[PDB]
């Protein structure tokens with residue numbers, strides 16, 4: 001289930017962080033509006049870029065903490081307020097988060113691995129709700 005998936009993802013975290021983020025940017029190319037230094041790059045070029053690998057892993061490190069602190073795929077209010085109040089997220093709306101979670105769920109459903117895609121879909125939904133409650137437009 002969900003707790004085991006958190007373990008799986010952490011066991012190859014820099015590969016999953018990069019592959020899921022690329023799945024997101026390829027499925028929703030207009031999202032590069034928020035990531036102007038990743039324009040005009042292939043997947044392999046982004047994987048060679050220091051900022052890409054370090055950004056994606058730090059993002060994914062925190063996402064897994066938020067997932068792990070959740071109960072029944074509902075994140076803590078303290079984690080949602082962190083994500084809302086982060087200067088880095090100044091320009092974001094919940095739609096940005098929804099799209100990331102659609103991309104993650106479709107990644108999991110396309111893998112041959114027994115990921116609990118329904119729990120991740122729920123988590124993404126619940127996180128979007130928590131971000132709204134914590135002040136995200």
Ligand code: HEM
Nearest residue numbers: 031034035054055058059060062063088089092096097100
């Ligand atoms: C659960 C979801 C997310 C978590 C846990 C999270 C976490 C983080 C963290 C830890 C950083 C700092 C990274 C660093 O400085 O190395 C960060 C920066 C940033 N995040 Fe998020 N983030 C989330 C979702 C998103 C989404 C959906 C967007 C936009 C679609 C976004 C846009 C950014 C941007 C633009 C930055 C700074 C510049 C850069 O990306 O390199 N984040 N986020």
Ligand SMILES: Cc1cc(Br)ccc1O
Nearest residue numbers: 017020021055056059060
């Ligand atoms: C939105 C997002 C998701 C992942 Br996974 C890695 C980096 C990033 O900015």
